[PDB]
């Protein structure tokens, strides 16, 4: 049960880190990938990754 509790406590760590690892694969509110070079957030298009 202590192992179960420790794994449950550590769960958010790997959850968040796997999500970040999926940054390029996944997307943000704007729709494009969380890490793209052509974010259409504002008229002055900018790229958050190269």
């Amino acid at each position: 049960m202590q192992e179960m509790g420790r794994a449950a406590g550590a769960h958010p760590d790997e959850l968040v880190f796997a999500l970040l690892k999926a940054g390029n694969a996944n997307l943000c509110y704007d729709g494009q990938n969380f890490f793209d070079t052509d974010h259409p957030v504002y008229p002055n298009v900018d790229g958050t990754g190269t």
Binding site: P40, V41, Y42, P43
Partner: protein, 56 residues
């Protein structure tokens, strides 16, 4: 029908080339295209604004 029009000779921020100057363009309260550019172009009015029914 489109709701949204500005016909009081009112001023709005329209940016032509490197500057934003008084001009009346889209002037609508609904958007389907050019939203990112419309925001800069559709800055709410400086002066009296009144709306009408273009129904275009």
């Amino acid at each position: 029908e489109v709701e949204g029009v500005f016909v009081r000779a009112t001023v709005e921020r329209r940016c032509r080339a490197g500057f934003c100057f008084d001009k009346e363009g889209q002037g609508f309260a609904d958007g389907v295209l050019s939203d990112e550019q419309l925001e800069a172009l559709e800055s709410d009015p400086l002066l009296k604004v009144e709306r009408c029914t273009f129904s275009g």
